[PDB]
Amino acid sequence: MSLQLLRNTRIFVSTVKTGHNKTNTQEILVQDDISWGQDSNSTDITVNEAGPRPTRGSKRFNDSLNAAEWSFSTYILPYKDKNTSKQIVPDYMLWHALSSGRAINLEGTTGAHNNATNFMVNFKDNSYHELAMLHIYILTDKTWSYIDSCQINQA
Amino acid sequence: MSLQLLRNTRIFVSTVKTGHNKTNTQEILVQDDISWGQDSNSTDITVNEAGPRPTRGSKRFNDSLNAAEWSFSTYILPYKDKNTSKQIVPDYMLWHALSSGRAINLEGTTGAHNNATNFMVNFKDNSYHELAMLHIYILTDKTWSYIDSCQINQAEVNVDIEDIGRVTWSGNGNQLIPLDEQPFDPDQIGIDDETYMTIQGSYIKNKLTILKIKDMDTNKSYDIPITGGTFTINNNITYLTPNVMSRVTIPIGSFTGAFELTGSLTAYLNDKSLGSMELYKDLIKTLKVVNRFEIALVLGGEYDDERPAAILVAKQAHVNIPTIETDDVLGTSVEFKAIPSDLDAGDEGYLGFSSKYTRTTINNLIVNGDGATDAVTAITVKSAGNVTTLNRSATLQMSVEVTPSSARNKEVTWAITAGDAATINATGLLRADASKTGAVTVEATAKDGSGVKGTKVITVTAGG
């Protein structure tokens, strides 16, 4: 018995559906304009006669579900973390899933990779039919939910 | 011919239109700031053309009737009636209408209801689309006039030093109606001189204003002298009217909006511990979106002898970040708004009006909810046989005593805070074992939330 407010939403970005730790999931600081959902398709079958006393009745069938839509806005907030002493943006896995389709490796030289000087994102390794795969976890007040196998369409 | 005068106008509040008796009508202690009247909406039609002969024409039409406006202020003078010997404010159905929409019932537990000790008004049953329906009767000299189906929009309570305790009511009615015939004789319904003496026996002076402020995340009660305050209860009532072109229309019922209990308290900055400055700096330091505070404003002061006082009890309030106001001597203002435990759980707050308050009475009203039910004040944990220590691997069922002996809730919890060499259960059986050579403590706090503390340092030793 409770109502859920949008202001209490918290968003976590994950690459795994189990074994969640600090290297696979981090919170993403979102704003008011956050939105998510999933629409469904249907169809009406109607009989179209021409004579007197025609049949006037319809019928609906659920036929398919559309892809889930999500969107949110975040501040560009570069900083250096104390653990690794390398400049990193908090929503770095979002940048990686946008940039390349390989497993995340900040030590490398393609996609989202950081350094002791700056955090860098290059698109030299995005030749993939399925980029790095995320799972957006949504926490509104008390109830949980998530979108399965997301992909970063744009930024 | 005969001119009607304002000073001779008397107000009567009713719950029914016919068969008015003493239990449905009363004379209200209104002041000289009364005002009422119903206005109307009108439409003007103009014509704009470009021809050689312009049509400078204007046609007016009446469209609808707006809500009837009424507003008056009354003195806060709680008292006990001789018939029931229970403390009741003279204008009790006004508080009932402000509180909940059920039938008036002083013997219940929701809405405006009295008791042998004090009159308490909760808003626990306020979750209605339409509150209790009244009928404001206005007798100016001899001509009668009443406002149909009034509902209390807000109650303006002003709490300022140099100002006597008063409350201002403002609401709306479906349609003000003038009457030629007397609905009921005012003399026997109007209060007699004896109950006027009884009412004037109790005055509430706002000069004696003491505030109880306490955060529920730190339990840092403050000592704040009040310079002046104001808290109001708002129903956000809007009347719904139909839109018909052919004929005029009148409002039809209403839907109470969002319940708002806001208040503003002005107080001088103090450098003393638990003062205004400490509260301000704590609030401006711990910038948190949500606040949870015990605010208990006590109009009229507190005394050992029975004294008239007015009480507001906001259990879980929201304190807005104060803005220190510059003046001759620094006096800050704090704004609060009581939020509920859950949006539809009620319990926004409750009030206390009575001429007979002892500090214990107001204390148990604040903590337990009623001025009649007693609450624990001090607790000393009692060992099973005046025992002071314990040896390794020995059982000890803790007992406890509570005061006063007339407390309604006497059961306490059992917990261990300082030291890790023993355990305690729900009943209080403290148990030790081997490898327990350190001193440990035991705690006890009642579930009524008085803030009582039961402590005793038991010297748990290694044993023989």
Coordinates of C-alpha atoms in Angstrom, one line a residue, chain B residues 122-304:
Chain B
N122 CA -7.1 14.6 14.9
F123 CA -7.4 14.4 11.1
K124 CA -7.2 10.6 10.9
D125 CA -10.6 10.3 9.1
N126 CA -10.1 13.3 6.8
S127 CA -9.7 11.2 3.6
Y128 CA -13.0 12.2 2.1
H129 CA -14.3 13.8 -1.1
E130 CA -16.6 16.1 1.0
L131 CA -16.2 17.0 4.7
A132 CA -19.0 17.6 7.3
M133 CA -21.6 20.0 5.9
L134 CA -22.5 23.1 7.9
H135 CA -25.0 26.0 7.6
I136 CA -23.8 29.4 8.6
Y137 CA -26.7 31.4 10.0
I138 CA -26.3 35.2 10.0
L139 CA -28.8 37.1 12.2
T140 CA -28.2 40.8 11.7
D141 CA -30.5 42.6 14.1
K142 CA -33.8 40.9 13.1
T143 CA -33.6 39.9 9.5
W144 CA -32.4 36.4 8.9
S145 CA -30.0 35.1 6.3
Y146 CA -27.9 31.9 6.0
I147 CA -25.4 30.4 3.7
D148 CA -26.3 27.0 2.2
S149 CA -24.0 24.0 2.8
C150 CA -20.8 25.8 3.9
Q151 CA -17.5 23.9 4.2
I152 CA -14.4 25.0 6.1
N153 CA -11.7 25.9 3.6
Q154 CA -9.0 26.9 6.1
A155 CA -8.5 27.9 9.8
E156 CA -6.0 30.7 10.3
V157 CA -4.4 30.3 13.8
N158 CA -2.2 33.3 14.8
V159 CA 0.3 32.8 17.6
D160 CA 2.0 36.1 18.3
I161 CA 3.2 37.7 21.5
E162 CA 1.4 40.9 22.5
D163 CA -1.6 39.3 20.7
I164 CA -4.3 37.3 22.4
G165 CA -4.9 33.8 21.2
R166 CA -7.4 33.8 18.3
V167 CA -8.3 31.7 15.3
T168 CA -9.7 32.9 11.9
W169 CA -12.1 30.8 9.9
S170 CA -12.7 31.2 6.2
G171 CA -14.9 29.0 4.0
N172 CA -17.4 29.0 1.2
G173 CA -21.1 28.2 0.7
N174 CA -23.2 27.0 -2.2
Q175 CA -25.6 30.0 -2.1
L176 CA -26.2 32.7 0.5
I177 CA -30.0 32.9 1.2
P178 CA -31.8 35.7 3.0
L179 CA -34.7 34.6 5.3
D180 CA -37.8 36.4 6.5
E181 CA -39.0 34.0 9.2
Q182 CA -37.1 33.0 12.3
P183 CA -35.7 29.5 11.8
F184 CA -35.3 29.2 15.6
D185 CA -35.4 31.5 18.6
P186 CA -31.9 32.8 19.3
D187 CA -32.4 33.4 23.0
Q188 CA -32.4 29.8 24.2
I189 CA -30.0 28.6 21.6
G190 CA -27.7 31.5 22.4
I191 CA -25.3 30.9 25.2
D192 CA -26.6 32.0 28.6
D193 CA -24.6 34.3 31.0
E194 CA -23.5 31.4 33.2
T195 CA -21.6 29.5 30.4
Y196 CA -20.3 32.9 29.3
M197 CA -18.7 33.2 32.8
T198 CA -17.4 29.6 32.5
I199 CA -15.9 30.3 29.1
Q200 CA -14.3 33.6 30.1
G201 CA -12.9 31.8 33.1
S202 CA -10.3 30.4 30.6
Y203 CA -8.3 32.7 28.4
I204 CA -5.3 31.7 26.3
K205 CA -2.5 34.3 26.1
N206 CA 0.0 33.8 23.3
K207 CA 2.7 35.7 25.3
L208 CA 3.5 32.4 27.0
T209 CA 4.7 30.4 24.0
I210 CA 7.1 27.5 24.4
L211 CA 8.2 25.3 21.5
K212 CA 9.1 21.6 21.5
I213 CA 11.4 20.9 18.6
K214 CA 13.2 17.5 18.3
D215 CA 14.7 15.8 15.2
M216 CA 13.9 12.1 15.0
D217 CA 17.3 11.3 13.4
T218 CA 19.4 12.8 16.2
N219 CA 17.0 13.5 19.1
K220 CA 18.6 16.9 19.7
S221 CA 15.8 18.8 21.4
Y222 CA 16.3 22.6 21.3
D223 CA 15.3 25.4 23.6
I224 CA 13.9 28.2 21.4
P225 CA 12.1 31.3 22.7
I226 CA 9.4 32.2 20.3
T227 CA 9.0 35.7 18.9
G228 CA 5.8 35.0 17.0
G229 CA 4.2 32.2 15.0
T230 CA 1.4 31.2 12.7
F231 CA 0.1 27.8 11.6
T232 CA -2.9 27.1 9.4
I233 CA -4.8 24.0 8.3
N234 CA -5.9 24.1 4.6
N235 CA -8.4 21.8 2.8
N236 CA -8.0 23.3 -0.7
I237 CA -11.7 23.1 -1.4
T238 CA -13.0 24.0 -4.9
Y239 CA -16.7 24.2 -5.8
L240 CA -17.8 22.7 -9.0
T241 CA -20.4 24.5 -11.1
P242 CA -22.1 23.6 -14.4
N243 CA -21.8 25.7 -17.6
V244 CA -25.2 26.3 -19.2
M245 CA -25.7 29.1 -21.7
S246 CA -29.4 29.5 -21.5
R247 CA -29.7 30.0 -17.7
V248 CA -27.5 31.0 -14.8
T249 CA -26.1 28.3 -12.6
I250 CA -25.1 27.8 -9.0
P251 CA -22.3 25.6 -7.5
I252 CA -23.1 21.9 -6.9
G253 CA -21.0 20.2 -4.1
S254 CA -17.2 20.2 -4.0
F255 CA -14.1 18.0 -3.8
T256 CA -11.6 18.6 -1.0
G257 CA -8.1 18.8 -2.5
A258 CA -4.7 18.2 -0.9
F259 CA -4.5 18.5 2.9
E260 CA -1.9 21.1 4.0
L261 CA -0.7 21.9 7.5
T262 CA 1.9 24.6 7.3
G263 CA 3.3 27.0 9.9
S264 CA 5.8 29.8 10.3
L265 CA 7.7 30.3 13.5
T266 CA 9.8 33.4 14.2
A267 CA 12.5 33.3 16.9
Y268 CA 15.6 35.1 18.0
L269 CA 19.1 33.7 17.3
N270 CA 20.8 32.4 20.5
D271 CA 24.4 31.4 21.0
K272 CA 23.5 29.2 23.9
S273 CA 23.6 25.4 23.5
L274 CA 20.6 23.8 21.8
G275 CA 19.7 27.4 20.7
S276 CA 18.4 28.9 17.5
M277 CA 21.9 29.3 16.0
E278 CA 22.7 25.7 16.7
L279 CA 19.5 24.6 15.0
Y280 CA 20.2 26.8 12.0
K281 CA 23.8 25.7 11.6
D282 CA 22.8 22.0 11.9
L283 CA 20.1 22.4 9.3
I284 CA 22.4 24.3 6.9
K285 CA 25.1 21.8 7.5
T286 CA 23.2 18.5 7.0
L287 CA 21.4 19.5 3.8
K288 CA 19.0 16.7 3.4
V289 CA 16.0 16.5 1.1
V290 CA 13.7 14.9 3.7
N291 CA 13.2 16.0 7.3
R292 CA 11.6 14.2 10.2
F293 CA 11.0 16.4 13.2
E294 CA 8.9 16.4 16.4
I295 CA 7.3 19.9 16.5
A296 CA 5.0 20.6 19.5
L297 CA 4.0 24.2 19.7
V298 CA 2.3 25.0 23.0
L299 CA 0.2 28.2 23.1
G300 CA -0.3 29.7 26.6
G301 CA 2.7 28.1 28.3
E302 CA 3.0 25.1 30.7
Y303 CA 2.6 25.2 34.5
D304 CA 2.3 22.8 37.4

